[PDB]
């Protein structure tokens, strides 16, 4: 008879090509129309191109400018030459002809059909993270299956992923502590995670508590955070012990052009650990110390995290409060630094928020078990971990094979000494809103416009 045989197709990156090819077991020249029709996974037939007897070629406004029809009358063929590929071309391809038998009548003939997969994998992880690093683990799944992982990090992305995943498409996979998890977990943003024990083995216990609501793990655990004392012991060998002595040893820096503590005053993830000291009663004695630095003026007013960080590796400040992540850039500058047990207040110990960076799978995501295979084989293995941490440190990783080198760091032993006398957050849905109450509470008492006893009956209702 005259059947069509299509063929060319595969999986392939946004913005690469595709040539589908469509031979048929008869002369073409006896066609009057040839054309190729799509079908994405429950939706109607969508015609993207055609050519006709006449050399006349039309194309579907989506398609148009970037698909090709093209023919060949002596291999008796029609092609599709997709270039410049998008998520929204994936679906099966088939081939289609149209025949005017020698009377009125017309025949319609159709092929096998060809499958077309336009994936990517997308991961959103913050700035301040190894995000390089993360890209190494991803271009090393790209050589083992063929999926491209574009690693991004958008600003506002704890606050932006709720918005754009629920709505739009957003990203597969998504980064940040586990206490904004719960929140995504109570809306319905997020696919529970179903890991064999196997690769539930290899993280410790206490690491896949943290990334779990309402008895179902909503997250995979990478590594504990806490926030230390990073202190310059050039310009200060034997550094404070207690923060009420941070006012004279300013004084004392002060006189030689250098500042004493500098630290992300905007947020309340690095101003959290001085309220929390010895609480209330302790929230309003933490709270006006650190309102009597910027009074004292020992501290700026709208001190963040990039003028910290500058100030710290430029060898300005003494001293600055910061995570795993911030140790990298300090040794790329020429500053012989320590990180330390966070200073005492009041004579107990201020007490940092612990968190536990985790990986979730957006619930509106099509590559959940591509993501899957990602996070478990390529990123949540000594290797895997091992290329994020040389690009910008982790933590105290969840990787039970990790507890030697981890051991072996110095660093990493002040990050656990302040994670002990600190807490891990609860992954509540309440989390957004307190974190909400305790930036503005602390921005407001800094720059001068509401009162220390103010803040906390605002911040309490
Ligand atoms: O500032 C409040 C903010 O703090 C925490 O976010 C940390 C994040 O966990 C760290 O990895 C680091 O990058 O800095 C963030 C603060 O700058 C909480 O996880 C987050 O919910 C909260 O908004």
């Known amino acids: 008879q005259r059947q069509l045989v299509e063929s060319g197709g595969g999986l392939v990156q946004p913005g690469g090509s595709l040539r589908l090819s469509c031979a048929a077991s008869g002369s073409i020249l006896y066609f009057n129309r040839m054309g190729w029709y799509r079908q994405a996974p429950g939706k109607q037939r969508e015609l993207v191109a055609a050519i006709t007897s006449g050399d006349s070629t039309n194309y579907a406004d989506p398609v148009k400018g970037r698909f090709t029809i093209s023919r060949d009358n002596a291999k008796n063929t029609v092609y599709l030459q997709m270039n410049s590929l998008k998520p929204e071309d994936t679906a099966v391809y088939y081939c289609?002809?149209?025949?005017?038998?020698?009377?009125?009548?017309?025949?319609?003939?159709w092929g096998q059909g060809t499958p077309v997969t336009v994936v990517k994998l997308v991961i959103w992880i913050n700035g301040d993270k190894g995000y390089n690093g993360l890209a190494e683990v991803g271009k090393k799944f790209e050589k083992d299956t063929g999926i491209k992982v574009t690693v991004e990090h958008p600003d506002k992305l704890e606050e932006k992923f709720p918005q754009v995943a629920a709505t739009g498409d957003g990203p597969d996979i998504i980064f940040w502590a586990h206490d904004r998890f719960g929140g995504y977990a109570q809306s319905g943003l997020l696919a529970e995670i179903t890991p064999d024990k196997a690769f539930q083995d290899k993280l410790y216990p206490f690491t896949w508590d943290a990334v779990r609501y309402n008895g179902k793990l909503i997250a995979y655990p990478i590594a504990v955070e806490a926030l230390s004392l990073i202190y310059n012991k050039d310009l200060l060998p034997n550094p404070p012990k207690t923060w009420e002595e941070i006012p004279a040893l300013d004084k004392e820096l002060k006189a030689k052009g250098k500042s004493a503590l500098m630290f992300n005053l905007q947020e309340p993830y690095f101003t959290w650990p001085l309220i929390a000291a010895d609480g209330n009663a302790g929230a309003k004695a933490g709270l006006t110390f650190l309102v009597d630095l910027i009074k004292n003026k020992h501290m700026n007013a709208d001190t963040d995290y990039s003028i910290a960080e500058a100030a710290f590796n430029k060898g300005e400040t003494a001293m600055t409060i910061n995570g795993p992540w911030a140790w990298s850039n300090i040794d790329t500058s020429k500053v012989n630094y320590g990180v330390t047990v966070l200073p005492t207040f009041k004579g107990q110990p201020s007490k940092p928020f612990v968190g536990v960076l985790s990986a979730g799978i957006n619930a509106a995501s099509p590559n959940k078990e591509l993501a899957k295979e990602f996070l478990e084989n390529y990123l949540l293995t000594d290797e895997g971990l091992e290329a994020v941490n040389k690009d910008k440190p982790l933590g105290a990783v969840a990787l039970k094979s990790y507890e030697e080198e981890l051991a072996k760091d110095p660093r990493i032993a002040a990050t656990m000494e302040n994670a002990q006398k600190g807490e891990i957050m609860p992954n509540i849905p309440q989390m957004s809103a307190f974190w909400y109450a305790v930036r503005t509470a602390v921005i407001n008492a800094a720059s001068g416009r509401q009162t220390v006893d103010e803040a906390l009956k605002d911040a309490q209702t």
């Open positions: 289609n002809a149209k025949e005017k038998g020698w009377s009125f009548s017309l025949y319609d003939y």
